[PDB]
Amino acid sequence: GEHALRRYPSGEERCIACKLCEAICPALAITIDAEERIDGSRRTTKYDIDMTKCIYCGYCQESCPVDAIVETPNVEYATETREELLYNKEKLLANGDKWELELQYALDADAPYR
């Protein structure tokens, strides 16, 4: 379902701008830009998903080596405007902060099989 960017229990964000989700995405829905953070870390400055391009296949969730991009079980996020479906980094991180418990249930059930 709806996409989300996850964090560690530290609070640090898991994504490291490897761009494998951007590369495997059949619909070219992901757009990423990155650089060296002030503390020397490889982290994204841009992470956008066009939901109106996405096919909800899960290839990004399979490709991620850090369990950063995931798909929640949510489907109840319909909108009145299409400019609300051009999700950005802040939206996705807030969505992860919102859905972390459901994602943890799903991961504890699903990770051995993937």
Partner 1 sequence: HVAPSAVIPVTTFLRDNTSTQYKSIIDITAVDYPSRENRFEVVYNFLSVRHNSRIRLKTYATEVTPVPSITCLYEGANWFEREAYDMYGVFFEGHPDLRRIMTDYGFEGHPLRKDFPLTGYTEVRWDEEKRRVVYEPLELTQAFRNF
Partner 2 sequence: KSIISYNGNTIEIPEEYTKQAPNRDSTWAPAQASKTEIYKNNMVRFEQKDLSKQPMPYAGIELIAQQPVRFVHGNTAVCDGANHNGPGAQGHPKIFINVDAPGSHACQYCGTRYEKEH
Partner 3 sequence: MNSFENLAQDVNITRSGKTLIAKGTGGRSSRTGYTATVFGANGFLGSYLTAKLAKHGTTVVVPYREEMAKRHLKVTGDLGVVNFLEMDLRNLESIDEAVRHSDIVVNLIGREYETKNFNYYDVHVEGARRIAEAVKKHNIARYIHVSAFNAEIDSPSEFNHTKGLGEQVTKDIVPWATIVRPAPMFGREDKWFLDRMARSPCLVSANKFQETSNPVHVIDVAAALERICFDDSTVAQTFELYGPQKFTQKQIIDMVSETLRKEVRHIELPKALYQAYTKATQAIWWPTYSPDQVERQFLSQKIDPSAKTFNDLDLTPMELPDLMFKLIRPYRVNTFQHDVSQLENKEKTFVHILD
Q: Please check if 110 is assigned to a binding site.
A: no
**Span near ligand SF4 by CB under 6 A; candidates 47-55, 79-87, 88-96, 103-111:** 47-55
Distance of CA 6 to the CA centre of its chain: 7
- Kindly list the strands in the beta sheet with 42-50, ordered across the sheet, starting from the edge strand earlier in the chain: 30-36, 42-50, 86-87
Over 39-73, what HEC string results? Answer: CCCEEEEEEEEECCCCCCCCHHHHHCCCCCEEECC
d(CA 65, CA 20): 9
Closer of 26 and 73 to partner 2 (Cβ): 73
**Span near partner 1 by CB under 8 A; candidates 7-15, 23-31, 72-80, 89-97:** 23-31
**Span near partner 2 by CB under 8 A; candidates 21-29, 49-57, 69-77, 100-108:** 100-108
Closer of 41 and 88 to partner 1 (Cβ): 88
Residue 10's SS3 state is coil
- Among positions 2, 43, 69, 103, the unique one binding ligand SF4 when judged by CB under 6 A: 69
| Radius of gyration in angstroms for the set of CA atoms belonging to the chain, rounded to a whole number | 14
Which residues of this protein are in contact with partner 2, per CB under 8 A? Answer: 7-8, 10-14, 16, 33, 35-43, 45, 65-67, 83, 90-91, 93-94, 97, 104, 107-108, 110-112, 114
